[PDB]
């Protein structure tokens, strides 16, 4: 502490004694229900951006690892939380908002973004936390004469 090999006579404050923890205890709700992520991510038809579908997720234990295991999701961007830390946390106010937009409008579904659908269709708050998932749906949400 004094940066010397000779210490003069006196009392010196060096560090702080603190007793270390002996073991780690994790307390989570006992209830285990597989969460219906299949319904939201594997649906055949999605809603329009003006009438975007909101699904409430509650009273389930969520395994986000399977989301990673099977995933054609070109974009998987999270804002207020780490993607790899989702399995270790507990949440409420969980909502899945599903809609279909253009390929170049995926940047606009974010807090503070400038756009047409951002202003008149779907608005995010500035303090939004969560993850935006975007994936191509040419195989299912397109038709050759024009899907309107």
Partner 1 sequence: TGVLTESNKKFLPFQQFGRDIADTTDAVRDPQTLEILDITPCSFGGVSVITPGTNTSNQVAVLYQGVNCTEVNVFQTRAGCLIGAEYVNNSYECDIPIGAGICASYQSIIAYTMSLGAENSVAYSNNSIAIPTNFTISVTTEILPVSMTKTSVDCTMYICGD
Partner 2 sequence: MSLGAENSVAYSNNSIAIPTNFTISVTTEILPVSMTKTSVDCTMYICGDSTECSNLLLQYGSFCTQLKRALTGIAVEQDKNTQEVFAQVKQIYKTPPIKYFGGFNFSQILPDPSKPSKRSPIEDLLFNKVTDLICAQKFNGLTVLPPLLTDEMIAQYTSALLAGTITSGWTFGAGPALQIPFPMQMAYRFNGIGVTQNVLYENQKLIANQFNSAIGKIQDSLSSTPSALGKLQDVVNHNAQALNTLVKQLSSKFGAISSVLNDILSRLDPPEAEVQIDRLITGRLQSLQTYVTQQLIRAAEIRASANLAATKMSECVLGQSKRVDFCGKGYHLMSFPQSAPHGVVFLHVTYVPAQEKNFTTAPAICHDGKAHFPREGVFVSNGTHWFVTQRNFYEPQIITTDNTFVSGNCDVVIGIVNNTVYDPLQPELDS
Ligand X SMILES: *[C@@H]1O[C@H](CO)[C@@H](O)[C@H](O)[C@H]1NC(C)=O
**Which spans of this chain sit near ligand X (rule: CB under 6 A)?**
38, 42, 44
User: What residues between 6 and 45 interact with partner 1 by CB under 8 A?
Assistant: 13, 16, 18
CB 43 → partner 2: shortest distance, Å?
Answer: 29
Nearest to 60, CA basis, from 77, 38, 85:
38
Q: 140 is in the binding site of which of ligand X, partner 2, partner 1, none (Cβ under 5 to 8 A by kind)?
A: none
CA distance 100 to 47: 7
What is the secondary structure of 43-78 as a DSSP string?
A: -S----STT-EEEEE-S-B--THHHHHS---SEEEE
**132 within 8 A of 81, measured Cβ to Cβ:** no
Question: For residues 26 and 31, which CB has a smaller minimum distance to partner 1 in the complex?
Answer: 26
Q: Interface mask (CB under 8 A) for partner 2, residues 35-54, using x and -?
A: --------------------
Both tokens of 27, joined, read 């307390």
Q: Interface mask (CB under 8 A) for partner 2, residues 96-125, using x and -?
A: ---------------xxxx-----------
């Amino acid at each position: 502490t004094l940066k010397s090999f000779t210490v003069e006579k006196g009392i010196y404050q060096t560090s702080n004694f603190r007793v270390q923890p002996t073991e780690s205890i994790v307390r989570f709700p006992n209830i285990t229900n597989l969460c219906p992520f299949h319904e939201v991510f594997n649906a055949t038809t999605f809603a329009s951006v003006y009438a975007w579908n909101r699904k409430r997720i509650s009273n389930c234990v969520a395994d986000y690892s399977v989301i990673y295991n099977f995933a054609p999701f070109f974009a998987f961007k999270c804002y207020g939380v780490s993607p790899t830390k989702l399995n270790d946390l507990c949440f409420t106010n969980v909502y899945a908002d599903s809609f279909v937009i253009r390929g170049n409008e995926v940047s606009q579904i974010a807090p503070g973004q400038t756009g047409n659908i951002a202003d008149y269709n779907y608005k995010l708050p500035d303090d939004f936390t969560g993850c935006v998932i975007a994936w191509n749906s040419n195989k299912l949400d397109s038709k050759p004469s024009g899907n309107y």
